[PDB]
Write an enzyme that holds these catalytic residues in place. Structure first.
Site, short mmCIF file in Angstrom:
data_model
loop_
_atom_site.label_atom_id
_atom_site.label_comp_id
_atom_site.label_asym_id
_atom_site.label_seq_id
_atom_site.Cartn_x
_atom_site.Cartn_y
_atom_site.Cartn_z
N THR A 156 0.70 -1.22 0.11
CA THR A 156 0.07 0.01 0.24
C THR A 156 1.00 1.53 -0.12
OG1 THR A 156 -1.80 -1.01 1.15
CG2 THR A 156 -1.93 1.44 1.39
N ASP A 165 -2.73 4.01 -3.91
CA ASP A 165 -2.64 3.05 -4.96
C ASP A 165 -4.09 2.31 -4.84
OD1 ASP A 165 -1.76 1.62 -2.66
OD2 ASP A 165 -1.52 0.06 -4.01
N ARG A 219 -4.03 -1.54 -5.03
CA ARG A 219 -3.70 -2.81 -4.87
C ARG A 219 -3.98 -3.30 -3.42
NH1 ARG A 219 2.13 -5.58 -6.76
NH2 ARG A 219 0.99 -5.31 -8.82
N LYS A 245 -9.03 2.81 -1.37
CA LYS A 245 -8.40 2.79 -0.25
C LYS A 245 -8.79 4.32 0.55
CE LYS A 245 -4.55 -0.10 -1.36
NZ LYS A 245 -3.28 -0.51 -1.36
N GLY A 259 -2.49 -0.78 6.49
CA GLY A 259 -2.25 -1.80 7.50
C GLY A 259 -3.33 -2.85 7.26
N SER A 307 3.37 0.49 2.89
CA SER A 307 4.89 -0.34 2.35
C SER A 307 5.50 0.36 1.37
CB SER A 307 4.60 -1.73 1.85
OG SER A 307 3.42 -1.88 0.98
N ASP A 364 7.50 -0.58 -5.09
CA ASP A 364 6.97 -1.39 -4.01
C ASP A 364 5.95 -2.26 -4.56
OD1 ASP A 364 6.31 -2.20 -1.47
OD2 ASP A 364 4.31 -0.98 -1.13
N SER A 372 2.43 -2.33 -3.52
CA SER A 372 1.37 -1.36 -4.10
C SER A 372 1.51 -1.84 -5.79
CB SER A 372 1.84 -0.19 -3.88
OG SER A 372 2.33 0.18 -2.57
#
Ligand SMILES: [Mg+2]
Ligand SMILES: [Mg+2]
Ligand SMILES: [Mg+2]
Ligand SMILES: [Mg+2]
Ligand SMILES: [Mg+2]
Lengths: 195, 231, 196, 244, 243, 226, 241, 250, 204
Positions: free
Chosen positions: F1, F17, F19, F33, F47, F129, F166, F169
């Site tokens: 994320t 993002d 994902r 999100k 999280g 992340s 990342d 993500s």
């Protein structure tokens, strides 16, 4: 305790349960009856942790007998098995769960059908033509898968059950001191006194 | 009248009738006398029987080695209050290794009785108590009323006809306060005091109840032939 | 974290770095660790950010309610409320707080409340991971009744060294001055204090 | 203290009657009449709404007939708000039973449960009783079609035909006169509407003043169907039976 | 009618008759007073000697709260003790949380809110006491008087009980004749006189005088009982004035 | 994320993002999100996904009731205070890491919240992340007095850094812009730089390929009349 | 007739205990007044110290609830302080939970809800007080919100409370009928206080010394009460024109 | 202390009457007139803003309240009782529905929850009934537009149009003559203003009349854009100017 | 030991043109031991279908719980619950056990009766909603199902084409999982007809 078997044939349900009670080092008893009559046409066998097994079985028995008196009516095997499942499903998230696995063999007088229910201590219920708990199924299911027919007589069911017990006595490391066999049909519950 | 239905109701003149009715139960009770010197403190109690077959109701209760009381009124209430005193005396000894001061024991009894006069549902205590004791400041005598009022005295009396004994002690004040180091003479003064409250009946061997506490004397109760000496 | 509070002639000054780390990652390089619990009672926070924020918010609430009833609280009173929370909940808290305040009667006062929840009134106090490296420097250089300019220099030099050696400390040096004149905020950037 | 203002709702009279229960029954006697009739092939529930208005939205309105589950319904006589409290409790009991045993609750067990709740308010708690009388129409595979009634005392009884609310004396006599054991639902529908038409305090019995329901095995094959009649359907059955 | 049978019931006047009946119990009690001096307060009380059997100087009436507050009351003595016990709990919890001893105005409201709470319900009875209390805090001396209704104000001088009218008149003279103020030692003497003068309303029985004081210079801001020579000096001064 | 928040001239922008993953497996390729606490207070969550959703809706529900009670439009500091006191109480067991942004009568605001109840103020923030990849972009290009267009550009560029670098993500960029004196504009799938290419083959089967034992009609209708 | 003793309905649909609590409101025989300026809200109240033994500095019916909110009370002081303590506690709790200062109107509503509960629940009596809350709200500006024993509350352009409220109310009504605005068009709070005192003098027909009045002033970010010497300066300015 | 009134204050009298409920209804009768009219494409609820004083700012007193974005309420009777019921109704819409199903309750079910609260004040220990009747107007996807009345007893009834309070008997007769099943929202508002004028003595304008509608979705009042399925509240309170415009075409 | 893989099993759901499909295996086991080949994991409440994988006692318990709740919903609402609403109810119900959760992987499938829009949704054991346009997978062979669905799926499949796609997705995924198989069921759901088909598959 150890081995409990069940088989539903044409017109009856047969429950076989071992007689041994072992407390660690010694076999304290070789004639223990691991079953309770819940109602005239419903029998429950049980196996699991010491103390909890009988405590649970007698608690269920008391509740079904209470229902029978209140309504002047015998609950169907399906209804009894659903009550038992809920109690175990409630129990598994308790402070100290009942460590008890049961088989419920009943003859439904309304439908004129035998019925066998297998319920483990988690509250996992399944209706089966034949069932077991613990390691019993590992030794016996291959024989039952082969020979079982839904139109079997009670006598044929007992013969197939003997073959299962013989295989258990051959390959199981523990001496379970034979089995007590009981038949549940339209006339009620009776014990086969020579097996 | 309209204001005596419960303890939570003041009258138009500011009176608490339920408390006053509880006070009345003490006046019906049998007479008991308390008096002290500088070395000893004495309780004398006239016990009451139901009839000639019956025993004489006990009047004096020990609360600790250095403290105890006599009762007049509802005996079960005295048992509740004396039990509470026993616990408080005991708490002081166990926690602080300290004998409970008689004055502090009075304060505790006052507060316990008070709560029963200001709340709904409850009732006042129906008993009066005379507490004697010997602590770090010498001999003491207290008078407890279920209104909550606790009073430290040289001598007193409560119960039926207690006024006769109280007047006698008021005359004898200067004499009995000086009876130091002589337990028998102090009890005599108490037996003579309680005699001023008797009518028709006299002090017999199962009638009389005496208690004493002092400098080198644990709280001890005398009944039966132990009080024949003073009859 | 490097935090300190120093009493001086005209009152007290609180000082702090601005670095907040999650392991070796700097989660916030411009943190404000100087916290207002009352008009002229502030505190420096060290330890768990969640804990010290929760505590500070409760104290601010307590002193706000105190003020409504009893008027302005003393610095001692504020320290006592901090201590009560820290001591009674010592098993569930990781908080090291320095309380600093200005009264007119008492003037500048500093109280430090370490992990255990004890209270210590001091002329000055240092705390946080970076404080270990400046015990020697601060002890040698602190004087009582310094001027405002001297105290600012003392804190600036002290936290400069704490930042230099402690990886957990860094960013800007924030300061809050508490005097009769009022409340003054100061900020000092890396290019200033690194050359000291 | 507070004792002064306590009515003491749960006490016997010198004659051994429960004051509040008796007075609650008096309240119920002014409620609109509800009738239940049990036939061999189903049950009929008929009930009169109390002096309505032309501006009342009837098609979305419900004051008399309530569904407890797919097999059991009730007719209400008394305080509607009190009834809805009990109805919701009954609905929950039915679902509790279904979850526990994996079978629909037998009619009498549900009735006994609600009746025990009513009883409790007459013996303890110091609260007023529920000013409600129910007619329970239901079906289970043990006793088949069943009619029950319960009242604020918590007492319940079984019936072939029964009325609650206003003019029950006149209604019960009329039902007792024309009811027969071999009767069918369509005949029972007619009896119920004829009885209400005679006992009503209104000038005439019209569709907008009625609530109507049937529980039939007139559900395709081996099952039971509840039918809460719509305003137009009540209007049609009134014409069919020759009342309007 | 019936509005006076239950506590917390408003009469058609807007009065709580049960609280007014509690005042009658206060008016029936012995005389107690309070005098605010230059750097402290003085409390005094009339103790009726019902009998010779009462031990002199033993049945103490004035009570200390914490170490800096004195409390005296007239009316039902047990009710006053109950109120002081609560006051001691309030003072303890205040000091526990805030460290500093409870200020007198702060303490005054703690008693006030508690007494007022006993006029909110019919399950409790109002307090049958008027309490005169006070002491020295960081802002100086404070004297308060608290009634059964929960009502309280700050006072220069305060009096309650059977001889309150007599006492009040005497207190008013002191306020007029001393605008600059009264010393602690003067206040003790004056307190003795006022109780002796107020004893005319209770002239049947003789009495025992009890005085206490908190003063910044004389007692270091702590509550102390006036004992021995200083008490006798005040008794002499009082006896001289009545003759 | 990867989630970011960026302050600008007359408001604040948040981005994220799309994902969501279970371990190394992508559960949803177009996850939402950006959550709404109130009309003009939005937040993004990293999280434990159920916790970020649940805590948003709870505080959002209580914020709505508070707004109705006080007859005032909700404030970001209220959402912040309610979130942190809830999260602190549960000692980080509710794994919600949020960036909270919005406009209210007081002005425009941007905060971050850690799962244990600690909060933070800033002009630019990143969480999840991919926060380090995002913060690298923010630290390289952020300046004071950004315009609306510049902030949207910076925010989405920071999310892209997370998307590409990342593994936690990916997929698309969602954006929400909250400007003072305006309606908050939610820009779902603002960027779509990860559309799957056409497959080499169609895998539509011939009818009758699957072996069947039994067929039956399922009765979804209620019990019928007559 | 126990429907007059507790808060239950009379046959007329009335709550007598609420009505009698309104009567207790005037027991102090004190009149209060509140007006709004451009930047401020002013509240004045009569101060009567009938006993010479009283400390006059402790005799007050104006309360500082929070930094921003002030409250004047019409009614007996025990109930007044009861309401004051609760309002202070509610204001502090609000700030802690929601992260901003409790508005004057919201506090008024909260205290009104608490009062409503006493009119519905039998074990609790109404408080015999009328609460006038004043502030300069950060969203609404100068604010006057008043609560009573019935649990009613509303905002005011200006208001008056006490035995002679009607005389003051009509006087204020007549002024705002002339000016045709919802406030006192004045820059400084000092002159708004002078207006408030002047119009109370006109309405009541009584002159005031510095000790006969009690004044509270709300400005942006603080509420404060005036000292006797601050009030004296106000009275001097009024007399000099 | 403790609430020692654990017994019912509302009880059945010998005649079967629940006195306290009847007396609560009497308090409602004394209350200011409020009304509701249902149209084909909306619902209107209206009442008079009976200002207690001209110094009072009657805009700060809201007699018509938003319960959910698609549900509004008005009352007759005791204002304080209404205000707390609105607070409870708003909360129960969230706790017993929106936090479970992720959507606002349908009008009939919210009405049911409010009714339950009012029923409990009629049976629970140590309380009196609420002294209000409520008119609740609302819209939801599957039931369309609806209007309900809720009484102190907890009983509720759906209406095409109705009135409660002071001049309800005359107002309901007026509504019976004017109402039909083909009314548009503007027609219902016009009838509402006509009906309400009869029960109002003094000033009759936008400042003395409170009027709200449940109608079309208002995307302009949503506060945000970007989600197609979210189209804004159907509840809208008419402004003082909007009312006065329709009073010229009266 | 891991509760979500004691009993085994899988569920998959897909959307098509004016239709949805939901499918499951029939195995219940005690780890290595096969216990039942008739343990269906798809249930329905009106026109809304719910598949549940994971611990079998919780599967049974939740089915009974949602039957309970949807029955009360219907009595009060006077209408059948919709897929979108039911999805929120499942999420709410799972999260209420946040710190003592049911060990399950629920899957919702259905068509909104008013809009006619096909709907599917998935959840983790504690209530997080995955509302995918294309497909939802769950169970001990969820990785295998993701692989099958990602390659086999294409949008707007007709009911009888969707049947083949979802059937092949399930079958081949189950044959790569030891704890899934022993039979399979596929529901093809249209606005007012639902067809249930039992598939023939290997019994090892
Ligand atoms: Mg922690
Ligand atoms: Mg560094
Ligand atoms: Mg009340
Ligand atoms: Mg396989
Ligand atoms: Mg295999």
């Amino acid at each position: 305790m150890d081995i409990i078997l069940g088989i539903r044939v044409q017109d009856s349900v047969i429950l076989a349960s071992s007689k041994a009670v072992t407390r660690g080092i010694s076999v304290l008893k070789d004639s223990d009856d691991k079953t309770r009559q819940l109602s005239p046409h419903t029998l429950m066998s049980f196996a699991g942790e010491a103390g909890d097994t009988v405590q649970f079985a007698e608690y269920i028995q008391a509740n079904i007998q209470l229902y029978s008196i209140r309504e002047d009516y015998e609950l169907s095997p399906q209804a009894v098995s659903s009550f038992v499942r809920q109690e175990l499903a409630k129990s598994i998230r308790s402070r100290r769960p009942y460590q008890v696995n049961v088989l419920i063999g009943g003859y439904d007088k309304k439908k004129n059908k035998p019925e066998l229910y297998q319920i483990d201590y988690l509250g996992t219920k399944v209706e089966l033509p034949y069932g077991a708990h613990g390691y019993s199924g590992f030794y016996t299911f291959s024989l039952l898968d082969h020979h079982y027919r839904p139109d079997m007589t009670t006598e044929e069911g007992l013969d197939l059950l003997k073959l299962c017990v013989q295989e258990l006595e051959k390959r199981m490391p523990m001496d379970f001191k034979g089995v007590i066999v009981k038949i549940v049909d339209k006339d009620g519950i009776r014990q086969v006194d020579d097996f | 009248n309209n204001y005596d239905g419960d303890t939570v109701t003041f009258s138009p003149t500011g009176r608490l009738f339920q408390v006053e009715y509880a006070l009345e139960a003490i006046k019906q009770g049998s007479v008991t006398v308390g008096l002290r010197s500088n070395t000893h403190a004495v309780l004398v109690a006239l016990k009451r029987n139901a009839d000639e077959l019956s025993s004489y109701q006990k009047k004096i209760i020990k609360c600790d080695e250095h403290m105890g009381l006599s009762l007049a009124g509802l005996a079960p209430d005295a048992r509740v209050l004396s039990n509470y005193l026993r616990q408080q005396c005991n708490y002081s000894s166990l926690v602080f290794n300290r004998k409970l001061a008689v004055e502090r024991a009075g304060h505790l009894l006052c507060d316990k009785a008070q709560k029963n006069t200001q709340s709904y549902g409850g009732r006042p205590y129906g008993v009066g108590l005379l507490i004697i004791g010997y602590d770090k400041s010498g001999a003491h005598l207290l008078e407890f009323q279920p209104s909550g009022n606790v009073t430290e005295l040289y001598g007193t009396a409560i119960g039926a006809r207690s006024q006769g004994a109280k007047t006698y002690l008021e005359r004898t004040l200067d004499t009995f306060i000086k009876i130091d180091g002589n337990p028998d003479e102090l009890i005599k003064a108490g037996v003579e005091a309680i005699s001023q409250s008797l009518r028709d009946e006299s002090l017999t061997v199962d009638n009389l109840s005496i208690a004493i506490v002092g400098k080198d004397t644990p709280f001890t109760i005398y009944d039966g032939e132990a009080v024949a000496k003073y009859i | 974290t490097s935090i300190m509070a120093v009493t001086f002639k005209d009152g007290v000054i609180l000082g702090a770095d601005s670095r907040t780390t999650t392991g070796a990652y700097i989660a916030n390089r411009v943190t404000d660790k100087l916290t207002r619990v009352h008009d002229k009672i502030w505190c420096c926070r060290s330890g768990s950010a969640a804990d010290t924020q929760a505590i500070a918010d409760i104290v601010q609430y307590h002193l706000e309610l105190y003020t409504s009833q009893y008027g302005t609280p003393s610095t001692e009173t504020a320290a006592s409320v901090f201590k009560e929370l820290c001591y009674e909940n010592k098993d569930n808290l990781t908080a090291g707080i320095i309380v600093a305040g200005y009264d007119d009667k008492n003037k500048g006062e500093v109280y430090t409340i370490p992990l255990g929840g004890s209270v210590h009134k001091l002329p000055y106090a240092i705390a946080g991971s970076g404080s270990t490296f400046i015990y020697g420097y601060c002890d040698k250089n602190f004087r009582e009744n310094m001027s405002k300019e001297e105290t600012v220099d003392f804190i600036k030099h002290s936290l400069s060294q704490a930042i230099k050696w402690d990886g957990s400390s860094g960013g800007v040096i924030r300061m809050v001055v508490l005097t009769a004149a009022g409340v003054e905020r100061l900020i000092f950037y890396p290019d200033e204090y690194e050359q000291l | 203290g507070s004792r002064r203002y306590d009515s003491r709702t749960t006490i016997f009279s010198p004659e051994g009657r429960l004051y509040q229960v008796e007075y609650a029954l008096e309240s119920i006697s002014h409620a609109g009449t509800a009738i239940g009739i049990m036939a061999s092939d189903g049950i009929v529930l008929a009930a009169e709404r109390k002096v309505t208005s032309t501006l009342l939205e009837q098609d979305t309105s419900t004051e008399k007939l309530y569904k407890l589950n797919d097999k059991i319904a009730v007719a209400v006589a008394g305080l509607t708000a009190d009834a809805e409290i009990l109805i919701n409790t009954a609905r929950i009991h039915a679902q509790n039973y279904l979850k526990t045993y994996n079978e629909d609750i037998p009619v009498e067990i549900l009735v006994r449960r609600l009746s025990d709740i009513k009883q409790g308010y007459t013996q303890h708690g110091g609260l007023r009783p529920f000013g409600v009388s129910f007619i329970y129409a239901g079906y289970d595979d043990r006793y088949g079609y069943q009619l029950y009634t319960s009242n604020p005392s918590g007492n319940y009884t079984g019936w072939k035909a029964i009325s609650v609310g206003a003019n029950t004396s006149a209604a019960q006599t009329l039902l007792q006169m024309d009811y027969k054991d071999d009767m069918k639902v369509d005949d029972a529908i007619e009896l119920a509407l004829k009885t209400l038409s005679k006992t009503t305090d209104s000038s005439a019995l019209t569709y907008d003043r009625l609530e109507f329901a049937t529980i039939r095995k007139g559900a395709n094959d081996g099952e039971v169907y509840q039918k809460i009649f719509k305003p137009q359907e009540i209007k049609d059955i009134l014409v069919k039976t020759g009342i309007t | 009618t019936g509005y006076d049978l239950s506590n917390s019931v408003f009469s058609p006047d807007g009065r709580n008759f049960q609280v007014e009946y509690a005042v009658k119990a206060v008016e029936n009690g012995t005389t107690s007073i309070g005098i605010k001096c230059n750097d402290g307060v003085v409390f005094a009380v009339e103790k009726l000697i019902t009998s010779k059997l009462l031990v002199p100087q033993k049945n103490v009436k004035i009570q200390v709260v914490d170490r800096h507050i004195g409390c005296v009351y007239s009316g039902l003595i047990p009710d006053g003790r109950h109120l002081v016990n609560r006051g001691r709990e309030e003072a303890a919890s205040f000091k526990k949380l805030y460290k500093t001893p409870i200020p007198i105005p702060a303490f005054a409201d703690r008693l006030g809110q508690y007494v007022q709470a006993h006029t909110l319900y019919n399950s409790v009875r109002p307090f049958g006491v008027s309490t005169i209390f006070g002491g020295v805090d960081k802002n100086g001396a404070h004297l308060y008087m608290l009634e059964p209704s929960g009502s309280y104000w700050g006072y220069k001088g305060a009096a309650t009980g059977k001889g309150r009218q007599s006492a009040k008149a005497e207190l008013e003279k002191l306020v007029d004749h001393h605008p600059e103020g009264l010393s602690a030692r003067e206040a003790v003497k004056q307190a003795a006189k006022i109780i002796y003068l107020a004893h005319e309303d209770n002239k049947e029985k003789d009495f025992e005088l009890e005085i206490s004081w908190c003063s910044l210079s004389e007692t270091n801001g702590l509550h102390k009982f006036v004992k021995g020579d200083l008490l006798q000096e005040a008794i002499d001064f009082a006896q001289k004035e009545i003759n | 994320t990867t989630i970011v928040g960026v302050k600008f001239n007359n408001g604040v922008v948040i981005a994220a993002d799309t994902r969501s993953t279970q371990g190394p497996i992508v559960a949803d390729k177009n996850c939402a999100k950006l959550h709404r606490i109130s009309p003009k207070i939005w937040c993004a969550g990293a999280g434990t996904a159920a916790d970020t959703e649940a805590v948003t809706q709870l505080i959002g529900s209580n914020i709505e009731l508070h707004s109705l009670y006080t007859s005032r439009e909700p404030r970001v500091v209220s959402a912040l205070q309610m979130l942190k006191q809830h999260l602190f109480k549960y000692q980080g067991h509710i794994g919600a890491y949020l960036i909270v942004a919005g406009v209210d009568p007081t002005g425009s605001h941007l905060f971050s919240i850690h799962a244990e109840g600690s909060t933070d103020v800033g002009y630019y923030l990143s969480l999840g992340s991919g926060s380090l990849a995002a913060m690298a972009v923010l630290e390289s290009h952020w300046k004071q007095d950004l315009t609306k267009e510049e902030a949207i550009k910076l925010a989405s560029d920071a999310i892209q850094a997370g998307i590409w670098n990342d593994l936690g993500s990916g997929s698309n960029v969602d954006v929400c812009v909250m400007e003072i004196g305006k309606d908050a504009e939610y820009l779902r799938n603002y960027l779509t730089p990860n559309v799957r290419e056409e497959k080499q083959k169609s895998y539509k089967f011939p009818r009758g390929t699957t072996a069947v034992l039994k067929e039956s009609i399922v009765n979804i209708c209620d019990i019928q009349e007559e | 007739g126990y429907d007059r003793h507790i808060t239950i309905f009379s046959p007329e649909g009335r709550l007598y205990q609420v009505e009698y609590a309104f009567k207790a409101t005037n027991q102090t025989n004190i009149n209060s007044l509140a007006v709004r300026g451009k930047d401020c809200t002013v509240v004045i109240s009569q101060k009567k110290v009938p006993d010479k033994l009283l400390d006059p500095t402790t005799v007050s019916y104006i309360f500082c609830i929070s930094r921003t909110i002030g409250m004047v009370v019409n009614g007996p002081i025990p109930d007044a302080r009861n309401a004051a303590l609760r309002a202070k506690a509610e204001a502090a709790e609000f700030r802690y939970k929601y992260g901003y200062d409790m508005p004057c109107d919201v506090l008024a509503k909260r205290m009104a809800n608490l009062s409503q509960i006493y009119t519905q629940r039998a074990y609790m009596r109404p408080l015999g007080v009328i609460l006038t809350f004043v502030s300069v709200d950060e969203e609404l500006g100068p604010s006057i919100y008043k609560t009573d024993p019935a649990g009613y509350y509303v905002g005011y352009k200006a208001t008056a409370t006490g035995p002679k409220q009607q005389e003051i109310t009509t006087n204020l009504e007549n002024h705002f009928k002339k000016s045709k605005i919802d406030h006192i068009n004045e820059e400084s709070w000092e002159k708004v206080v002078e207006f408030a005192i002047t119009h109370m003098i006109d309405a009541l027909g009584t002159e005031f010394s510095k000790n006969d009045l009690e004044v509270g002033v709300a400005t942006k970010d603080k509420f404060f009460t005036l000292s006797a010497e601050n009030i004296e300066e106000r009275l001097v300015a009024i007399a000099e024109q | 202390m403790t609430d020692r009134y654990s017994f019912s204050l509302t009880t059945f009298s010998p005649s079967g009457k629940l006195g306290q409920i009847d007396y609560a209804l009497t308090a409602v009768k004394q209350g200011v007139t409020s009304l509701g009219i249902k149209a084909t494409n909306g619902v209107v609820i209206a009442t008079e803003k009976k200002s207690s004083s001209p110094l009072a700012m009657s805009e700060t007193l809201s007699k018509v309240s938003l319960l959910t974005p698609d549900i509004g309420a008005v009352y007759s009777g005791m204002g304080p009782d209404y205000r707390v019921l609105v607070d409870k109704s708003r909360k129960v819409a969230h706790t017993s529905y929106k936090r479970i199903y992720g959507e606002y309750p349908p009008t009939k079910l919210l009405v049911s929850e409010v009714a339950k609260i009012m029923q409990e004040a009629t049976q629970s220990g140590g309380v009196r009934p609420f002294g209000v009747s409520l008119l609740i107007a609302g819209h939801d996807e599957f039931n369309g537009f609806s209007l309900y009345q809720v009484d102190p007893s907890g009983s509720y009834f759906p209406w095409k149009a109705t009135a409660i309070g002071k001049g309800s008997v005359a107002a309901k007769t007026f509504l019976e003559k004017r109402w039909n099943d083909e009314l548009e929202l503007e027609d219902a508002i016009h009838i509402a203003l006509l009906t309400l004028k009869e029960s109002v003595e003094g000033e009759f304008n936008g400042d003395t009349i409170e009027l709200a509608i449940i109608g079309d979705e208002n995307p302009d009042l949503l506060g945000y854009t970007g989600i197609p399925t979210d189209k804004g509240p159907r509840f809208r309170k008419l402004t003082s100017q909007e009312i006065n415009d329709r009073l010229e075409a009266l | 030991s891991d509760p979500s893989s004691i009993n085994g099993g899988i569920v998959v759901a897909m959307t098509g043109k004016d239709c949805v499909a939901i499918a499951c295996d029939l195995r219940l086991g005690s780890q290595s031991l096969g216990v039942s080949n008739k343990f269906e994991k798809i249930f329905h409440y009106g026109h809304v279908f719910l598949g549940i994988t994971g611990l079998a006692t919780d599967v049974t318990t939740l089915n009974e719980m949602f039957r309970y709740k949807t029955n009360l919903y219907k009595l009060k609402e006077e209408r059948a619950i919709e897929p979108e609403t039911f999805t929120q109810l499942v999420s709410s119900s799972l999260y209420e056990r946040r710190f003592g959760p049911y060990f399950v992987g629920p899957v919702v499938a259905g068509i909104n009766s008013k809009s006619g829009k096909p709907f599917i949704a998935g959840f983790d054991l504690i209530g997080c909603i995955d509302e995918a346009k294309d497909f939802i997978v769950s169970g001990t062979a969820s990785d295998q199902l993701f692989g099958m669905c990602e390659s086999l799926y294409e949008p707007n499949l007709e009911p009888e084409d969707l049947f083949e796609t979802i059937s092949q997705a399930l079958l081949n995924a189950a044959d790569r999982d030891a704890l899934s198989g022993w039979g399979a069921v596929v529901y093809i759901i249209k606005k007012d007809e639902v067809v249930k088909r039992y598939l023939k598959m290997r019994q090892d």
